[PDB]
Amino acid sequence: GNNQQNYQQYRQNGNQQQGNNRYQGYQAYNAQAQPAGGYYQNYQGYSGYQQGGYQQ
Amino acid sequence: GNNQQNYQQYRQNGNQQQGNNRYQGYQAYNAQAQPAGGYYQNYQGYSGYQQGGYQQ
Amino acid sequence: GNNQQNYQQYRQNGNQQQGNNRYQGYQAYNAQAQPAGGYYQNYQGYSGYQQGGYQQ
Amino acid sequence: GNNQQNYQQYRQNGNQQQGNNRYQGYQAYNAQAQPAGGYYQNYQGYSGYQQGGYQQ
Amino acid sequence: GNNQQNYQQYRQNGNQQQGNNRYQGYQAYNAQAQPAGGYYQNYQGYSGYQQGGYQQ
């Protein structure tokens, strides 16, 4: 048959990305995919942080 | 038959992303997918933070 | 037959994303999917935070 | 049959990316994919942090 | 049949990339892919951090 088993364990005592005026597009901790078929992942378009100025 | 089992455990004692004027597009802790078929993930379009200025 | 079992445990003693003037598009803690078929996930369109200025 | 098993364990006592005025495009800790078919990963478009100035 | 098994273990006691005015395009700790078919990875477009000035 089909048998899929997932065990994810996450602890944290320190700090993560402490600061001002920062961009973070894609972040992942303990990320996993196990489909029984194909895996299609798509990211298309605009992802932006604009603090004033002129952008085109 | 079909047998799918998921165990996710999350603890946290520190701090995460402490600050001002920040962008975070996609963030995931302890993320998992195990479909019995295919997996289709799509992100299409606009994702933006604009603090004044001119954008086109 | 079909057998699907889910165990999710979440504790937190620290702070998360403390600050002003911030954007967060997609955030997930302890997220999991195990359908007995396919998995179709779609995010299409506009997702934006605009603090003044001009956007087109 | 099909047999897919995932074990991810994450601990942290130090600090990560502490500072001001920073860009982070793609970050991943403990990231894994094992589909039973193909794996298609795509990132197409714009990903930018603009602090003033002129960009075209 | 199909047999895919993943074990990822991550500990950290030191610091990582502590400082101001920094760019990080693509970063990965403990990253692995083992699809049962092909693997297609694509990164196409713009990825930039602009602190003032003129860019075209």
Curated annotation (Swiss-Prot), chains A, B, C, D, E:
Record localization: Cytoplasm
Superkingdom of the organism of origin: Eukaryota
Region called Disordered, residue ranges: 1-28
Note: [PSI+] is the prion form of SUP35. [PSI+] is the result of a conformational change of the cellular SUP35 protein that becomes self-propagating and infectious. This conformational change generates a form of SUP35 that assembles into amyloid fibrils. [PSI+]-aggregates sequester soluble SUP35, resulting in defects in faithful translation termination by read-through of translation termination codons. [PSI+] can be cured by GdnHCl and by deletion of the molecular chaperone HSP104, which is required for [PSI+] propagation.
Domain observations: The prion domain (PrD) is a Gln/Asn (Q/N)-rich domain, which is unstructured in its native, soluble form, and which forms a parallel in-register beta-sheet in its amyloid form.
Function text: GTPase component of the eRF1-eRF3-GTP ternary complex, a ternary complex that mediates translation termination in response to the termination codons UAA, UAG and UGA. SUP35/eRF3 mediates SUP45/eRF1 delivery to stop codons: The eRF1-eRF3-GTP complex binds to a stop codon in the ribosomal A-site. GTP hydrolysis by SUP35/eRF3 induces a conformational change that leads to its dissociation, permitting SUP45/eRF1 to accommodate fully in the A-site. Recruited by polyadenylate-binding protein PAB1 to poly(A)-tails of mRNAs.
Assembly with partners or alone: Heterodimer of two subunits, one of which binds GTP. Interacts with polyadenylate-binding protein PAB1, and TPA1.
Family: Belongs to the TRAFAC class translation factor GTPase superfamily. Classic translation factor GTPase family. ERF3 subfamily.
Protein name in UniProt: Eukaryotic peptide chain release factor GTP-binding subunit
Residues of the full protein shown: 7 to 62 of 685
